[PDB]
Symmetry: D2
Subunit: 237 residues, 4 copies
Amino acid sequence: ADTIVAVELDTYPNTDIGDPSYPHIGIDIKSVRSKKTAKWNMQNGKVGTAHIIYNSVDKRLSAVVSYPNADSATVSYDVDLDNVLPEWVRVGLSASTGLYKETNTILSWSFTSKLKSNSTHETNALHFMFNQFSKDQKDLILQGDATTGTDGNLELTRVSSNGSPQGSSVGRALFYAPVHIWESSAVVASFEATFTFLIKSPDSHPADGIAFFISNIDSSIPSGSTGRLLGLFPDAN
Amino acid sequence: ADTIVAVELDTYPNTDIGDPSYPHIGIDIKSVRSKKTAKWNMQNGKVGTAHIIYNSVDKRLSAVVSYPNADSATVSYDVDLDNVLPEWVRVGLSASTGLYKETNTILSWSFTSKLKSNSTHETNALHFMFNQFSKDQKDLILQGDATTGTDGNLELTRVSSNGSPQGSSVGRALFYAPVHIWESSAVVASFEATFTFLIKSPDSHPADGIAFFISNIDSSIPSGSTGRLLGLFPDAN
Amino acid sequence: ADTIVAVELDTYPNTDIGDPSYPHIGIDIKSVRSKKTAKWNMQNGKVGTAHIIYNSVDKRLSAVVSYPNADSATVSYDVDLDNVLPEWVRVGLSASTGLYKETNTILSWSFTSKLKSNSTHETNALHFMFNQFSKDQKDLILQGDATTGTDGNLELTRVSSNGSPQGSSVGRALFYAPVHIWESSAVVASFEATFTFLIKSPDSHPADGIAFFISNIDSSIPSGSTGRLLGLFPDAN
Amino acid sequence: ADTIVAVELDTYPNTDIGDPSYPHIGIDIKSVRSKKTAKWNMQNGKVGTAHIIYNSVDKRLSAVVSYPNADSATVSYDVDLDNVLPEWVRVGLSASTGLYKETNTILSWSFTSKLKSNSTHETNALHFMFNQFSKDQKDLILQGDATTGTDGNLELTRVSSNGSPQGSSVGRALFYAPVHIWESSAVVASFEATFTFLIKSPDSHPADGIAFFISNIDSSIPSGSTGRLLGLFPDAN
Ligand SMILES: CO[C@H]1O[C@H](CO)[C@@H](O)[C@H](O)[C@H]1O
Ligand SMILES: CO[C@H]1O[C@H](CO)[C@@H](O)[C@H](O)[C@H]1O
Ligand SMILES: CO[C@H]1O[C@H](CO)[C@@H](O)[C@H](O)[C@H]1O
Ligand SMILES: CO[C@H]1O[C@H](CO)[C@@H](O)[C@H](O)[C@H]1O
Ligand SMILES: [Ca+2]
Ligand SMILES: [Ca+2]
Ligand SMILES: [Ca+2]
Ligand SMILES: [Ca+2]
Ligand SMILES: [Mn+2]
Ligand SMILES: [Mn+2]
Ligand SMILES: [Mn+2]
Ligand SMILES: [Mn+2]
């Protein structure tokens, strides 16, 4: 099984699996049943921004999602990631559709990770920024239905030539290099991620969502994870 | 005026104004009587590192002070800086000596503040890093007894040619440009500061401390702030 | 007299002062008569980008100006800036109008300067990024007619409430802190600047241009520098 | 295949394959016979720094190698990397020993590449910084005899437990993620690399050198590349 820590932007309430009865953002620690959720006023067809931050001193994972001239939704959860994740991890973006569907377009993604060790002036850092995706983006491992390059964007799920999102799709984009997210002798370890997205549905209920995730480096899409499982979990427990 | 938020590295216990009876690190929100403290095992004559972090989503000001392969001291306090500080501030380093003394040497100092406002990708940022200070450090406002260029370092308090710290000294170094640390339409505002210091005392009785502070842009050393007031407060209330 | 090194985006050919007979970009070392110029196809009413770069190893000052889906114009000049400029300098943007006029709007500006000294891991750095300007931008010294905050933009020259650029205007925006652009013991000193602009004229010939400049820290707009002198030079020699 | 661009720090003169008869630094464009060299006063047993820079506007690859307060060696060569390299590359460090030997220790390594494309503000960037290497450095591909974690450093060639370098050794360390160093619609593409090394030889006769290189992503050490071929070339043509 993979170890997944994710920040989900869930557009479809699967009441039967623990979702709140509204679009929401949530912190998922190894289960799709979010440990904390916040009401999110998703704006169909508009470009939004999600900011995710964590540092080993506060041990608080927080995320803010906003649309220009709208209020933000923010959710935080106290978690000591050194007890949940392996030392080396891969980071990525995941999305899915099921009966209902929506485009899960990523227009930009940036990430920064820093390990500041005990003997200062011994920081290790990794930062990558994507403001354009190209047709053959060799630094991204694309899984499932994910593709790059259409209008210089990353399409996490299948969308037809005429712009229509397809149902029962699931895809993930993971950055190629392993990330050292924590290490025993660091006095401060922190990371921040930011991505802009465009979710638009034709049908009355967009589904299923987008998630920022951190996993074991060899993670792959689980069998049966389309729909409500966001291409992250094998079951809904 | 002046409004001060400071992270103090207090080496002398002034139990009459609320200090614990041991060297400590504390978060000072407009008063020398720290809102939160943590015991600090100050190592006389060794170079240590202080890391200060804050972000408006968590509204938690945290500081870590370590020495190469020694345990670190950490202190955190929940505070919404938008309700304490002006929008525009100046950041700096302060130090003082009283009847007892020590060298308050700064070997490097860096700071970073970022404001990610409402609109997709509209970020404002400021970053400066000094790993060596020159005799004519034009981008620093030196107040009191602070000098630069002695061995490529910043001396916040008076030291004599022979390397001996003087009593009743106070000095502060402020970065020249005003900093926008908060703004009403920012989705996320955050800052990080790091500095390495060397506190050395001829006898085993150092006083008074070093402090990283954020103040109104027009701040100047208050009268009588040597000693226990760290060059920061006018009184001990 | 001030010492000015500038990269001009000149929209009006003042043939009588040495300009080429077309819009052009040029490297100005202490004189408005550019040491090198390149033909520039200015696109009225479109947002463009200028990138300026220099490093002490190559001692080449280069600038590229482009508009999306258009060819860029680039100009380079070999100059050892340590022999032209003071060690400490202020950097800014300047613009002017004369009989003919245009808006000289800056939508974003970012700058990075680094001094890497001999004993490595002793780099000094300064970076600031502005993607939004506010009504009271305290970290910018505005000179002449320059104002900030209209649509979160920096207007270097006067433009009426109804959006009309005015003639005989000149204004400059300089970053507040002095910049150390070179120093005797650095093994590498480099800087890069980037700004996006929107120049639109109602009249048949926009004038006069925008310039990125580096000057002595106390520089002020010279008397008679509106029009063709870009608010940078006292005469046209 | 393989296509190699490298900056070599050559400590042993192989006058038969074109080396000057002194230790030198050189720019190698697909051949060990450097296109340009500069004399290097290699200081046995001291830690030195190498800085490599390149930007597509000037199309000039420059390198500076210095030692604390000693004169630096500089070498520059005009080359359009878009005509030599694939779009996607891997960057790494290489070293070898032959009949004579030395330690080829890397103490820190950082790299930064940025692509500023046509559209206002659409920049892609990659930055990694290693100031300490762990035994399990998962984001580095180690080829040959290179190992990490010995004292927090990268040993590119074989050293014995007692600190003695071995002959006929070759090893390379490549950053895990492919790097986009050039792209057809980029207005500006640039990269900077810095690394600190320590070359120590038991006798006063070190060989063979260390080299920073950029290659096709699938590059592996060529057969017989120990010694003078620096683990980079198959032959000496
Ligand atoms: C009706 O159920 C189907 O569609 C929804 C919405 O798309 C998914 O959440 C769910 O997994 C799938 O089984
Ligand atoms: C005994 O007092 C004096 O010396 C101590 C230590 O320097 C200071 O804290 C104090 O303000 C000053 O009055
Ligand atoms: C016709 O001349 C006037 O207008 C032009 C264009 O605006 C300026 O360059 C010049 O300085 C001013 O004297
Ligand atoms: C005399 O030769 C041997 O040793 C030298 C120095 O190590 C290498 O350059 C060379 O390739 C190898 O053949
Ligand atoms: Ca759901
Ligand atoms: Ca005290
Ligand atoms: Ca002109
Ligand atoms: Ca050789
Ligand atoms: Mn959910
Ligand atoms: Mn105290
Ligand atoms: Mn001109
Ligand atoms: Mn050679």
